[model samples]
Structure formats: C-alpha cells, structure tokens
Target: AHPFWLQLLYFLFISLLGFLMLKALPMKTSMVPRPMDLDLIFTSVSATTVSSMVAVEMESFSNSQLLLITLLMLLGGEVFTSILGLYFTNALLMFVVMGYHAVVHVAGYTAIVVYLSAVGGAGAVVAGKGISAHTFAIFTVVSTFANCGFVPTNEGMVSFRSFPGLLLLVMPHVLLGNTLFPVFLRLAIAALERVLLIRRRRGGGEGYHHLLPSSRTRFLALTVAVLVVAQLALFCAMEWGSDGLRGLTAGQKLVGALFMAVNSRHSGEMVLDLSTVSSAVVVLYVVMMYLPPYTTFVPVQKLLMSPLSCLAIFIVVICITERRQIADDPINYSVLNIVVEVISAYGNVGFSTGYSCARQVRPDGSCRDLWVGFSGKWSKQGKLTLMAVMFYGRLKKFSLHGGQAWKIE
Candidate 1:
C-alpha cells in the first residue's frame, strides 16, 4: 500500500511537469505526429490506461519505460478531472458513506478496491519467484480496472499459480461502481426529480412529489440491478453450459459473470483468448460489445418526455460523459475506457476454460504452431480483430458518449 502511495506521488510530480511542458510548448494535436512520437504517446496511453493492445512488443521497452506505463494506468481515465472536483466529491461521498452525511461515489470506491485487489494478488504471486506471471496479472488487473490494457508477452515461461487472472473480471464492477453505474444512477435520479417537478406544476398533490422521488430511486435501482444480475446469470450459463470445463466454484462462476458485464460496458478482463475460445462465447461477446447502453440514454418513457426532450438529455449526457471531458486529471488523458475495451478484445483475457489457458503460451510454442493455435496465429480474422482494436485504441480522441447531458442521456 505504501509503495503504491509513493508510486502515486511520483506520477503526480511527473504529470505536473508534463503539464508545464505542454503549456510552454502549446503544440496543436491537429498537426499529425512524427511516427516515433506517435508510437510513444499511443503506447504510453495504452500502457498507462492499461490497454493491452499494441502493434509492437511492449517488453522491448526499458524498465524505466515500464514504470512510467504502470504510473499511467494507476492514474486511470479520470486522471484529467480537476483535483478540486475529485477531492470535494470524494470527501462528500466518503462522508455520505460514513452515515453522518449523505453522499456516495460508488464507482470511485469500486475502482479503489479493484486496484488494491490487483496489487494484493499480484504481490502474492510475485513473492513465489515464479517469473513475472504474477506481475503481469497485476498489470492486467490494474490495466483492466483502469481500463489500461498493457499485458506482457504470454510466452509460456510465466506461471498461472492456480488463479486465472480473476482480478481482471473485477473491472466491470469497478466501471459500474465508479463511472457507468453512477452516471446511470444519476440519470434516473434526475429524471425522477424532473417528473416530480412537472407533477407539482400540474397542481398534483404534495403526496405525488413525495412518492415520485423515493419510488423513482427504488424503481430505477431495481430495474438496473435486475438487468445487471440477469445479464450476469445468462452470461455465466452460456459460458459454463457450453464449455466442457466443469466443477467451477461459486466464486469463479461469479467472476465469469462479472467479466462479461464489465467487458461489455467498457472492455477489459478478456478471459477467453480469441485464439482458442469457442465460437459461441466470441459471438456472444461481439454482440454485447456492439450494442449501445440502451440507445445512449433514450428516456425510459418517451411518452412522458417528448422526443425533443429525450434528445436534449441524450446530447447532454454524451457531452459530459465524453472521455476527454470526464477525465480531466493531471495526465490530461482519455485512454480509460478504450484501453480496457481494446485489451479485452486483443488479449482475449476473458477466455475461460481451455481457451483461457491457451492464451498464456509462448509466442513460438506448440499452440502458436499447432493447427488450432496455428490457425489462430495465422488467421486473418484474429489479426483483423487485433488491427481493429488497435486502430480504435489509437484514435483515443474518438468518443462513445456523444456529448453533455443533464439526465440519463
């Protein structure tokens, strides 16, 4: 914990220097980058954001470079958010959780927990001196939670230590807890308030307003909870029922469920290596990844709010939720969500069962040479998928959430 704190401080200092440099130079990003600089920044964001996607060998970089990457990932996407906003919000949320006050940042705490867990688990594995598998796993988990997807080469020399990098699967909850879920929850709460205000304007009784707020919160919570749980259960059933892998503990299965949920939302913790996973899981994964989170905040009741009203909300959410706007940290970075998404796709980190094991092989090993492995290595599809992931990842400025919105949108 102390080491992580020190690491955090070092990152803060470096980022401050970077900011000063940027202000002094004031270069326009609109100008194209030189190839080497392009590669460095892209790779830096990828590693720091914990994105595992890369067209080059990450290990070739020096140890100092690797340390820089680790710092980047630790700072995460929100590294760009104003420190004042973060401190104020964090204090308010902490107080609320303490029950003397009333505020909560579910995603912030969740991200912290996931990050801590990754460090803890990785430490346990590294102490055994079985090479850097544990260190890689720690990187993977940190990358996943931070949505930075830099993973070391899966060359077979590394050991698994009985845990299949389960920490990565925790990314979904962190995303839900820290970012996405909080946004969604805020939207629902805002909608409830607006609806109550309208009812009051219409001269509805005071009781209607009372019912509107609490009931809306409960209803939205229930709806989102049910949706998440049902999706998790279904995803687990699909993965477990189809695969020959059996006798999974309740916890493992739960992790599997969480892996899908997290990956779909923002990408990270790719358990199923694309090279070896069953087509079923891959197809399911692709479908889930492609869908928008309910049309990007289209109101739940279009009749209650006009299409124009819904559209306004949608625009606002997109603007505010935009990666650059939301993550205004010292790094001035935006690799958070994309880092995880690309890694989940490229590393196939969620590939459970036999598929997951096969991903951890040496580059020139049996799997990479054998028919199943050979085909994966040589196949255009997997390569194309990697290409696409990298392409998307490199275009870090491209945003998913459209623009700023007040409520759900």
Candidate 2:
C-alpha cells in the first residue's frame, strides 16, 4: 500500500532533522572544540539508522545531546518503531501490544537503576564520569532495547565490563527487542487468545500484516537459536584466555565472552576493544553480522545484486576515498580493517576495530590512542559514503526482493 519512495523520504527527512538538532545542541565543555558538520552528519545518520558507528566519541556529548541521540535511536530502531506501527493499525490488540512494549522497557529501566544504586551509592561513579546512575540506566536500557550500541560512557561498554550482573540484565533485553521478539510476542498473544476465548475471524485480519505469520515466526525463532549458540561457543573457545578477555576471571570471562557473542549478531556492543581480538574471530564476526537474522536456508528474496556485492562496492568506494590514508597507515587502514568497518556499517552493527595512533605506520609523538571508531578517523568523502551505507543498511528490508534483475542461474 505504500509508495516506492515513501520510506526513503521519511528516513531522509527525519535524519536531516536529527542532524540539525545534534548540531544545534551544546556538547560537554570537556570537548572544547565542538564537532564539525561531518561529525554531526555521521552521528545523526548512525543513530537514525540504528547503526552504532561513532564518528565522534560517546562521552563528548552532554546529557541533553545524549537524550536527543536516544530519541533518534528510538525513531530509527526496528523494535521501537514497529511497536508504534501497531498504534495506527491496531494490530495484535493495539492497547495490549503497546502496553507490553512499555512494560518491558519500564521493567528493564527500573531494574537497571535499582541494581546500579544497590551496587554503588552517593559516592559512586561510572567510568569516572559524574553521570548519575539513573541516566546511565535509562540510556543503557534504551540503547540495549533499541539494539543500538551507543553508550553515554567514555569507554563505551568497556567501562562497564567489570559489572557482570549489569551486563546480564541488559543482554536479554537485546534479544527481546530484536531477533527473539517474535517468539515472545507470539507466546503472549497465544496466552491472551486462550484467556479471551477469541479466534481469528475468517479472512478479516487486516492488521496482522505487521505480525509475521506463526509459520514463519517458528523458523525465525529456530534460526535465532542456532546463530546465538553457534557464535557463543565459537567466541568463548577462541578468546578464552586471549588478551581480549584479559583481566577477567574464568567466571567473569565467560560473561564477557557471552556479551561479545550476543552483540556480534546485531546491536553491536563491545566489552573489550575489538582490536585485541584475533583475525579469525573478527572475520567470523564479520560473516555473522552480514547474515540476516531470518536465515532459513531458503530463497528469502530475489535481488539484482546480493547484499555482499552492495557491501563490496561500498568498500571499494571508501577505499578510493581513503587510498592515501591507507597507504600511509597500512596497519590501521589495511584492506581487512576497511572491510570490517564497511561491514560493520552495512550490518548496522557498531562493532569497530577502532583507530589507534600506536599502530600508525609513521607514529607521531603528539598522537595518542583514542576509543573512537575506525571510521571516525576517515576522510570527509569516506565518512559521507559510510553515512549513505548506514542509510542503505537501515532500508535493506525493502530491497529483499529487489534484485531479480540479475539472474545468475
């Protein structure tokens, strides 16, 4: 029922507004020089597309700015907006469905706040910043539920890696908001149907379009389980005692690895700097991120060009834009690293092998390592290309059946 360009127009419109808002907002005084237009555009596109790639460091923004970004995340986040979709169409019993979403977010928010308060009180601090427990809790909860890995803390998830329970509390929310949503929602709907004693009227379910048929939901659940377990086992085995999992006890390391694996698929969060991870694990993660969540081993759609091809083209374009930098900083800007960054953007997964001055081919004495994303240090043209890539990633669902123009068979 929607026009071809309707969705694209809406996304572009909202993203433009978000960019303007972020640019107008005041950043923290600690970041003396405010971000430039390129930084603002990248941040807006990243949040609006629910891609956690950061052209600017997380902590540089003030609470007001962070709240705006969270607003943008909710606007673009798949789970949050789809719930809003039910509001207009009255799908799955509109009041009940919306209430379920609100309840889940509220419960998660309250739990995070109480747990943080219990663990640390008036004298407490997180990442050595003055942000309150309540702010951190809501920001973390919203970002987690939205499956957008943006964090208010300076070090991203690394700052909270020591808090295993905190990690535990949010991880389930991540699944509930994304890959595991249908399983739980269907169960809830089935229980309601049992109690209400109502059956689907014969061919009158106009509103059910938003909710996938149970037949497909079943396979989706199975696929989610398969991928989660596969990655969990692989991540733990590969990084068991590696430097990536260093400074963590066996028990703590298990949780750390679990956190890493869970986020690798979608909603990119990282407890440790991904740079320390081995190429094997990182390569596997790139493969994982590109795989659709509903991987049923069947023809999901026909496309003129595969998503891999789309990603490959984008990588080559960025390589063109960043060729000189790559030549000068081969270790940091190697083809593999470029692939990882481009794939991360395409997957809308925030996992990045961040840029480090220490790895620079011609190291500068004044340069120091920062926790910004790999693309954060990219040139203007390269950054613009990634912004477009993030938008492309966000709208990928529309392209599922779009590539029938080129038939290999």
Worst 10 residues of 1 by lDDT: 370-379
Q: Indicate which candidate wins on TM-score.
A: 2
Candidate 1 lDDT score at position 252: 58
TM-score of 2: 0.91
* Candidate 2 wrongly placed segments (more than 4 Å): 1-4, 87-92, 121-123, 194-210, 297-304
Residues 48-128, model 1: lDDT tens digits: 333344433434443334445555555543222222233444442222212211122233334544543566754444334
- Per-model TM-score, in order, reads 0.44, 0.91
Report the CA-based lDDT of candidate 2 relative to the real structure: 0.74
Best by lDDT: 2
lDDT of each: 0.38, 0.74
* Candidate 1: Cα lDDT at 193: 63
